[PDB]
Amino acid sequence: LAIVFAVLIAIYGVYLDQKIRSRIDGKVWQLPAAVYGRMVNLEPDMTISKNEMVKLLEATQYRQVSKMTRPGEFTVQANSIEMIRRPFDFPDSKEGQVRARLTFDGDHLATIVNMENNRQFGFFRLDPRLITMISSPNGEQRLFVPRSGFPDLLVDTLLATEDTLTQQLVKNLFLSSERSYWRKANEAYMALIMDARYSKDRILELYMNEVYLGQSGDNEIRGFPLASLYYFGRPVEELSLDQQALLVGMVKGASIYNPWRNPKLALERRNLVLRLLQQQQIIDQELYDMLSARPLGVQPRGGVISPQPAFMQLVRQELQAKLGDKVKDLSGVKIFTTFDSVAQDAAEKAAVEGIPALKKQRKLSDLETAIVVVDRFSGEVRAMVGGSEPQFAGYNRAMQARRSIGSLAKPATYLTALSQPKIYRLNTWIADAPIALRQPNGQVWSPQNDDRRYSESGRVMLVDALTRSMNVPTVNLGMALGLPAVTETWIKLGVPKDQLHPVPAMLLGALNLTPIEVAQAFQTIASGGNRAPLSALRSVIAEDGKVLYQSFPQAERAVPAQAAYLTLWTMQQVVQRGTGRQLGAKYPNLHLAGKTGTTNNNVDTWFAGIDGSTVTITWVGRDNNQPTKLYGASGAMSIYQRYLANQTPTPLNLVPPEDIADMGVDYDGNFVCSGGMRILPVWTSDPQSLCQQSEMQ
Template identity: 85%
Template sequence: MAGDDREPIGRKGKPSRPAKQKVTRRRVRDEDYDDDYDDDYEDEEPMPKKAKGKGNKPRRKRTWLWLLIKLGIVVAVLVAAYGVYLDQKIRSRIDGKVWELPAAVYGRMVNLEPDMQVSKNEMVRLLNATQYRQVSAMTRPGEYTVQANSIEMIRRPFDFPDSKEGQVRARLTFDGDRLETIENMENNRQFGFFRLDPRLITMLQSANGEQRLFVKRSGFPDLLVDTLLATEDRHFYEHDGISLYSIGRAVLANLTAGRTVQGASTLTQQLVKNLFLSSERSYWRKANEAYMALIVDARYSKDRILELYMNEVYLGQSGDNEIRGFPLASLYYFGRPVEELSLDQQALLVGMVKGASIYNPWRNPKLSLERRNLVLRLLQQQNVIDQELYDMLSARPLGVQPRGGVISPQPAFMQMVRQELQAKLGDKVKDLSGVKIFTTFDSVAQDAAEKAATEGIPALKKQRKLPDLETAMVVVDRYTGEVRAMVGGAEPQFAGYNRAMQARRSIGSLAKPATYLTALSQPNQYRLNTAIADAPVTIRLSNGQTWSPQNDDRRFSGQVMLVDALTRSMNVPTVNLGMALGLPAVIDTWVKLGAPKDQLSPVPAMILGALNLTPIEVAQAFQTIASGGNRATLSALRSVIAEDGTVLYQSYPQAERAVPAQAAYMTLWTMQQVVQRGTGRQLGAKYPGLHLAGKTGTTNNNVDTWFAGIDGSQVTITWVGRDNNQPTKLYGASGAMSIYQRYLG
């Protein structure tokens, strides 16, 4: 910890206090009976034996007095030695690494440039997903206003991986679906490049189960500090770590009530208990607490103590993790940074200090509201706010967000992040305390994917009477391969089986574009208008059996153009084409698209989808096609920054030429025909202006349904099926494509 946070014992910076009156004590001295007694009384007769015993009383008093003095000295030495021990214990933690901070995981940083293809409505959705708030008049960071053709915003300050940037007032002007200009409202200059602060999406679990987001004392609003002190320790700046006034008040209140109704712990004592002691109820623990509080108060500044307390206090539970400190609690309950809280929201968090479980706003909203208003009343009574403001604030609802609305586990996406961290950092992954992890996560895409799953799957379950229907969805950037969103099941936040990365299923007709891509890679032999045989075919397999594929309608047309065969997802022409090309050539194309070699068996049925891939592997293949034949390895990790600012990892997305560009574009154009007039025409009719490309997929007996959707910027792979491999009674268009349609909104 910074050296200037510490002060020597009896620091000069402590607020002055009234001088304490010295209480003089009269020292009683015994006479020296050994000498003076003989000199003054040698001529007198000896005293009786009884009188002699009375004469020895001063000697006995002197003996006991010396014993008490010696005992006092021993006790004082022991207490001082124990104090030295406690001081060392306190300094070793507070001056060192106070907490094992969890790693904070952020979503993608959105980079804006003039002339970008982004509409005003898209920008509003992006700002909302990044927890910006639309207001009528901006007053603080994290707010924006919307005009006819522009958006004005105050961007939050943020420590980006390459630099720290302060808050900025900016005006974004739009011309239709294009971002025309970005203006700095403070100096009227034009930005050529402008980036938004990323959203905190989750935190990696710490070893002790405590989650916190550290903020320095200067980052806390003064009004929040005033509210805390007014409620919990109004004499904080006057006492030395323990408050005799509070102790006396508590004793009187408890004696009057006949039971413990009031405590006397200062914020410093509470901090000591949380950092060093247990919750044991004993006099020894309380004595330690008071002693250590005196040491902490003497050694550290009041601001340092407040900084520690406000980052340490317990404010709730999220699953197995404790919510520690006001900064994380602010995001957890309200979805906004602590410096952007309104006074009533601050009062709610301060009120929860007394009992985060009892006053949990989701579990006990009525008690929570009463507690919040009590805190506001204390502020009003202490003239921090006036009656009018109290009436307005106390009339407001709690205003908490839906549970888990901002910081959520994101189990599917985070599984990929953890795998990449292990691959990129090696042994360094064992200690990620305080690390900032920047990912490719897109909140807008993830929210849309989760909504599609949580609304679409229940509808299909009800429609098909299949209670065990499941889904998976992967959304990737069309050109960079960055993973934008991932859903691992019908309950996206359930940390169980991640079907997006682990469910290896037969892909059905999603395999067909690879065969046509192989053909179009040989332009001297195959073009979109090349005729392909659509006639019965029987193929002898290696085991001696024969295989005779059929079209879905059981009909044959003799010949069909290549483009129409893929558009209509015809089986027989595809098999004839694949066998003419040769299975090794088709397999080679799959390898170039990024499919794992161990899943590619040279059997004729693979042409129609007899190969098992996960949704993330399918996404890699279609990303290569969608980007014009350039394969960019899918990734969820952008950079990893250590607590001290050291760059532990930085990705630089690169794509390599995998297949001929012309062949990829023609395959993609044919997939657009699938949406316009083929098996995905229902989707094309609903979104005629999006120029979507897609491919449906259905496996034997309708066990698995797939859809690959491609728009101007993203590739989305959707799977719908059952974990027990039983029929779904669905096709690619009625199953997976219906979920993708909900994703598009």
């Protein structure tokens, strides 16, 4: 003939159907790991407000409305909130939409009701915000969604504009781009092998998770799902039509139709797509003119290349330690972190506004800052700020900046003393006179009080000593207990052993830590003496639902509860009438426990603040170690009081442990069985400590 040619293109035909088998049956992409924040459970009589609740919802992608029609929305009432808790695939159970009314009375959430059965919820799951994605070596970022996850609507917006789909599809996942006619043939040929072997229903599952729709550095953003988030901040399913249009309009043009870069060309493309469905039955003139009028593109406005960079450092670090290298191999990995968006916003805000207000107020060139927030009892890390400009960064001062803590070291000592309830109490009289301290060579160490003065009487109760952050008595104290012990306390609060150089000055701050290390130390005390090893990770779950890693309470008794109690109580004095008295004046009803830090020549300032739920380490200083001109620890307090004012802190109600009892002491500081001018908590099962003190006579 020769019709031999037709024998070859057919046997060629079955070779491309044997290639599409290996491709689509199973592994279509190496899907990068998804990173989600904390999964919060709301509960009857939970200690949360309606206002708080708004912020929380709003921080986890929910949108206030007047009347509510799609998932991820909420409407506020005078004592209640109605909301549609979005479908989410929780490790504990997959779940769907749920319409629920949260009802409030005071500080507590009273009930939580399903609005289809008017039945209560014992507990109610709130889906975690998607924080970020990690890249694939490949450098293509998608987010797999079932075809049924896309509204049938968006599909029709897709179709009405683009269907030659099974045609497009193949090229992207299979062939090069615009290399020859030679390939378009391949395409048309494959394009009917596909539409033959795999159903229409499945095709646009594979399509809508392949389409290149945006850019973030050197990784291509592909997939309707992920684009929705990227550009707007909501799942494709919750996309309004103006947004879906932008998406569907962008399928052709992925950079020239980019909104960030060119509004005109982006808007001009969308308003075209808004009229591409007007010929179509779906759109009625009344709608079209309105949608086009509604400026479709929701601008943060940011590129959002590397989100939560500081926090992620830790996460990435924690993936490595608990799962080695063989995470990257795996596809469709779901990683659940301890991250807290409300705490984070509050943190980032508090930096961004705090720092310039402290340069301006004090007239500075540079002033950097770091904030680390972790669960009082769990150690779970809820927020982390590495610098004054925390959105965009490569240096994380929460984790890398190792700066002497100065004062941030005083309670190690007191807790050490206060662990001995037979000998040291809060009313124990420490000496407040001039010290001199020969070392091997050459000097004689002679630490002065902050004010360079000394207590008229020659002494000070231990309770006031710490409250005031008085140095002299603190060295007198430590040098009586001995540096090895003060060092043992540091080891047990969980500070990096290599860091402790047990020499007198450590007592006052010769100790360099990173905010996160200090976060650990003060956690251990905040929890009443259980050290809980900090972490970012709640779990790591595979695509086939399968647990690769799960965290579990690994907390450890580090110091006596009574000792932590007493020490913590004292740090409530620190904030109420001592070194942090300025916060205590602002938030008296918090009864915050905390402690101030100041290095010499004001290079570093700390504040360390415990409320009923968190511990918040706040550091402020200069990268170049120069003086900060910031008199006192206030500098970093001014950030902390910013932070507290951004979120809704939990007031600190210390529950005294066993063998605590409030006793009276006289002006001379000896206990009294009735009366006394000053009531102090004491570690005794039997408080006749006082009788035996009263026999002084």
